Symmetry: C5
């Protein structure tokens, strides 16, 4: 009854097109804040951030006032979209197909005219994602809010500190903070400020998933490629091991494909590490082929060069600490024995080529193990957030 009288009275001559100020020259203050509930997606390719956010707007409507003694029990009235005036505050850098992601709830007003509008939404904002340091990257995503048509002398947009009391932690990203900043804009025509409120969402990528599902499968496969150097050449499986390890890494590259970004703004750190892994495993297969040329060298081919003999068999091998009728019977038997002697001389030349190949294996083992470690620790710890990341995620 009092409620029914009040609602009928409040809408009389009310124009939702009117900015509700007692003085049309003076400004209308709007307090803008938001409440971040979730970070939903950080899409690299589309360059979009998806968040669950409750916007908070407060302002005063000069016309929606009543004395509560004259309307006992009626302390607040609600109005649905299109019935009272509302600030046209929109997310400027919206990437949503609708552009306005808000669900238009009721606007709460008390007897003094204080309006409270709490539109929820699943916002999509345009954000430049820098994947240079991926997986250890850190993003700074701006959420720029302002009025679509009212300058600062009409809609004076003020800012209130963002709320994160109901924030759900994500499993992919840390929330560092969501500071806001009210900034004015100026047109050369005029002196009027044009305010906006930008909340910069700062978020750190969690790296436990990437450590356990990429580095460990990648380091382990990268270590098996070095295992070729410990495998004898007589196993007949040195190429089998190395080329199948490369094949495994080709198969693993498909998993890496899905998660990897797809940009040309930089080479991601993760792409450097996996790219390097490929080269080291590819070169291991190369030196394996060179080793087998030594191991299977023809005994009746080119004599071991002096420099080959000097470098491998002496210096490197020291550094590595390796190291009537009866007369014709005499003729035939001697032929058999001297043939065994030639066979043994060729076997000894072959043994020297085989030891040269063992020495090249030990050198390739050391060289590749060192290169592997220095490329792993160097690429990974290059990231400015590496130590922090491992400290918080492991």
């Amino acid at each position: 009854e009092f409620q029914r009288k009040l609602y009928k009275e409040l809408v009389k001559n009310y124009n939702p097109l009117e900015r509700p100020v007692a003085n049309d020259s003076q400004p209308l203050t709007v307090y803008f804040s938001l409440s971040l509930l979730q970070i939903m997606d950080v899409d690299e390719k589309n360059q979009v951030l998806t968040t669950n956010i409750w916007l908070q707007m407060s302002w005063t409507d000069h016309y929606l006032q009543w004395n509560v003694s004259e309307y006992p029990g009626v302390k607040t009235v609600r109005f649905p979209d299109g019935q009272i005036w509302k600030p046209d505050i929109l997310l400027y850098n919206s990437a949503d197909e609708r552009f306005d992601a808000t669900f238009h709830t009721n606007v709460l007003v008390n007897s003094s005219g204080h309006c409270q509008y709490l539109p929820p939404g699943i916002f999509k904002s345009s954000c430049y994602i820098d994947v240079r340091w991926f997986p250890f990257d850190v993003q700074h995503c701006k959420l720029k809010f302002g009025s679509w048509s009212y300058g600062g002398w009409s809609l004076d947009l003020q800012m209130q500190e963002a709320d994160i009391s109901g924030y759900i932690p994500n499993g992919e990203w840390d929330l560092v903070g969501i500071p806001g900043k009210r900034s004015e804009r100026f047109y050369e025509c005029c002196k009027e400020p044009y305010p906006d409120v930008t909340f910069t969402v700062t978020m750190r990528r969690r790296t436990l998933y990437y450590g356990l599902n990429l580095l460990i499968p990648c380091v382990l496969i990268s270590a098996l490629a070095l295992l070729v150097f410990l495998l004898p050449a007589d196993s007949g499986e040195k190429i089998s091991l190395g080329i199948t390890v490369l094949l495994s890494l080709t198969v693993f590259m498909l998993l890496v494909a899905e998660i990897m970004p797809a940009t040309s703004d930089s080479v991601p750190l993760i792409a450097q590490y996996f790219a390097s892994t490929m080269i080291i495993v590819g070169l291991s297969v190369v030196v394996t082929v060179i080793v087998l040329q030594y191991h299977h060298h023809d005994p009746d081919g080119g004599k071991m060069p002096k420099w080959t003999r000097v470098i491998l068999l002496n210096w490197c091998a020291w550094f590595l600490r390796m190291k009537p009728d009866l007369a014709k019977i005499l003729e035939e038997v001697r032929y058999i024995a001297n043939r065994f002697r030639c066979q043994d001389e060729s076997e000894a030349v072959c043994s020297e080529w085989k030891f040269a190949a063992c020495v090249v294996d030990r050198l390739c083992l050391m060289a590749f193990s060192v290169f592997t470690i220095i490329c792993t620790i160097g690429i990974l710890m290059s990231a400015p957030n590496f130590v922090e990341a491992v400290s918080k995620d492991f």
Copy 2:
């Protein structure tokens, strides 16, 4: 005719903005329940629960009353959205792009004014999914409902036990229960309660799919890696078997990729088991290479150390229960025979290295079989719901 008169009479001076109470100071009770028909999706990455739910709301409209003797045959009237007042009860933790998932059906009212509103919907709710114990994980998803703008002195939200009589069992999740709880909230300004009704949907992941399409393909591939230790070194296929088993497991890791979650909140149990499998198969290839170094050891290399001879050939091998012209003719023939004697001495040294490699194979077989079983049974039975899970799903 009576119906037409009643509908015209009921809308006269009716304001859908008005909370329909005879006394504007007294509260309006709303009975809130839901009916769960389906659990549609439990998305780990988005942290969203998708459910088919029929909401149930009941309340009394003071204005929608008539005497049925004066309107014979007209016992109930229906009203579409926006014509009568409705409670603004919304899912607070909604993750839907629309935020309101309900389909606004008609509100049923009888002659006494009892309103019944049964909005169906496909709701999307924000839920923290804990995949620590995946596949044996259990989720507890809150569905928090309340009025967007009416405190407890205005909209007194009461709760009724949720219905599951029309629940369709899922193929991925058990339904443990859906208990509800009415909880009040307080603001330091005021003494008024702010009620909400939270239905906590508790659901257990069924594990038959994961047993049959992951463990069995994973255990079987994990067992073939142990088969390398029974394969002779003379087959020339020991690396072929082990490295192709690893390759198969790299290929299987791609299938595992799709289903696995993608978080850094914890290491899922399934990730521990598959990660361990990789290490055990990788190490099997490592010890295989060590075995081949023994099998293919040069007869003219370093003599079998004392400790090598003691450890392998004696202790471990016992534990395993393994164990003129004519004178020149004499010269040449003796050379041939003494050459055969040296060849046999080198063959015997080689046989002792080969038996050392057979002993290392039997030891690696036992060690890896034990490690495999203890990591399988230990990781799997670590899950607090393991015994239950297997009891209900197998």
Copy 3:
């Protein structure tokens, strides 16, 4: 002119909220049918059926009547959504995000008041899909239609036989039939029936795609694993063949992954067949390793046991129908010859171990071929619809 007069006359005092009966106590009959044009999707995971369906509703509006002599040429009038009354018949088990999939076309009415409403739609219905017998499964999907708010004394819902004259045959599913059944419901409060009309869409999965893209690639790969038993042990490729066949089957398991359902309600028939295939191929690699232990057995190891010699070399091999100076010269020459004699004795022991391995190969060939055939024909023909399926699809 007559049309314009009629439309103005019909809407005078017309309330689209009013159920259009001359007597408000008597019921309003609604004839409900549908026309199935397409089966669009049978989604296992979501438990949803997608269909193209034209609903058919007929009823009488007491108010939309005119004499055609007074309105010459005007025999029918059409009305768009929200202008005249409409039955609130909805699909109860809808799984659509909108819940109402219908496109609200015009309602056709003739001079006698007979209304005809033909809403088309792409309906999504909740359906339990039973994939126990997949690919030979048969689904029975209910489409339950009724009025959201009118009991049987108000809206008397009658059923008419469903039309399939414009049905487009699917490439994935046969249409067995779409019988309907009008069923009443009762509440313990009251005696009034609450009717619904359920059309049960019965559909058989076509199996030609699954025969040609799974069984044949699976049987062929399953046959190559048995080919290992015909491969000699001297090829040096027995493990290569078997383990690469398993690798191929691991690669094929990824294709199988996409199409396979993902439930824990049962083990699908297809999952049993492929799971069995894995075991048989895995065990083939196991017995291959055992065969190579016989083939490569050390001549100076443990003597062939009696039972090994009895079982393999006699019984199984029969069942398979297999089967001064001069004196020192004498000393040296005799050493050479007796060494050749020992070498030949060891070669003969080795030949007996090698024949034992050939016998185990022939036995493993027979055993695995029989197991393979019995598991293929047994799993496949277990399906209650197997013979029919092959008869209609091949």
Copy 4:
């Protein structure tokens, strides 16, 4: 001013429910055409065609007429949806979730009452796709348009030739043509025609993508399988080559999976060709195993049968154009020499088995090369559109 007067005058007593004819018994002619801009998708699984189309409708409104001398400068008026009458022409075989894909633009009317309505849309139509001859298939997709509620005595639907002047050529499909045909329908009740206008979009699949990304990768892999027959048996890599080629083809089958349709209406031509490829490569591995049994046949096994010796070594090999103290010393030396003689006899028997295997290799080479070519050229040129397709696409 004249425009403002005209718009106010035209809407006076205008009913958008009224079919706008001067005589309510006479029909209203509607000229229907469309303009095809793009073919967007031909989805096999969903059985849907997606097209960008501008519909064209023309008709006369008896009421929207004015004299332009009385309204100088005002020659045309536009009206938005729901303000004037519009034909309810819809795509009958629509597969869109909205069913009406049109964007409701303004209707253009001149002073004589000629209305022009040009609704654009992205239409989804139900089309049976026949993939029997895929990749050389040709589709004929009907777009059936008619009025939802007006028979031919009310809405006389006439047809105008479709426009393709603004058609964007597709990269996947040729446009053969889009002929239309006006067809009447009759109900046994009545004599009134029920017209529809069906535009049959005829489109040929372009095959360059499928030639270059499937046939060439498939023929090349199919040729490498035949390369096994030229590889010597002493390489020790014959199974390695063949089984890895099959593995590669298993890996290639995954790419084939994505693009292949998924129906059981027929076996696609592409499925026959790839299915045949599998069999030929599988059988190549089979005959390779048979070849190795000949190559590695035991010298002390079963003597080469007469028919084996006759068939292979003579006929096929011709067709292929292949082809005191001293006495004991005598005893020991003779033993050594006669042992070498037996070894050479066994080597010669082995050489004859090895040549038999070379002959089986040359025969298997010829047989498989011929089978391969005849299955490639036969399957491919079976397609009725093969020669045309290659002529237009290559």
Copy 5:
């Protein structure tokens, strides 16, 4: 108060159907521009461009004028969709399911009647994408804007230079420019121009992603195939290396599949390069098989032809710079020695076939290395934008 009076005054007799000109014969000028914020997607298959764009429209409304001295403080009024007249400027080549992607914001008007409409949107436009030169391709996408129903004497559409001040650089595409051009159209009926404004978005594909994730993995795998020629034939792993490299390339072809376009309008440059890679690796396996036939040639087969001996062993090998009782004892011993002599003659014939195979390896190495380099540099540098692309992206 002044604002409320003004809004009430402006809507009095205002018709949003009226083009707002003082003279109905004279035209209404509309200044059209846009502001490009983002390039979101360049979809090859759908032939669609997705962009984030703020449209800019300016025009004069004759009716929305007031004197600001009479309305102090009220300098601008805003109006929502459907309240004032708006130009019906649409994107003609729209590929959006809604066709109108704009979010209808308020129209800003000042006291002089100057209207400003700034609709944002995520536009989808139909664009022919030419992937002939992919990854070095350059696209020219037209965005054709015009009025749906107003010719040039009614709506005179003028163009203003497009803004890119708020353009976010993409990670996949450079923005070369967005020039616009106002073009008139003529109908043979009439002399009136029909203007449109086309902004041609020109954009260059960035190629760093494609260099690092395709060329390098492709060149490296293409180089390992050439490594077969350096591998000795005695390793027993030449086919293993080559066929596994091909297998790896088959696995890599799956990654290539996802990113590759799917058209038959041309063969993309990337498809030529990868297709060529396959042939070169396939042929390497072919020549490897030929090499092994030489290496494993039977010593007792066909004598090395003259031309074979001349070509390989002389010319090519020079170009490559390679190069009583006692009498019976005599009989037996001579048999042993002459047998060793025959064995050595066969070993020497075999050595000559083996050196012929080494020569064919060195020739195949040179031939394939040259072919590889010329096909890589030739295909890649064929692209007209190659040098630029590498200069800007590397």
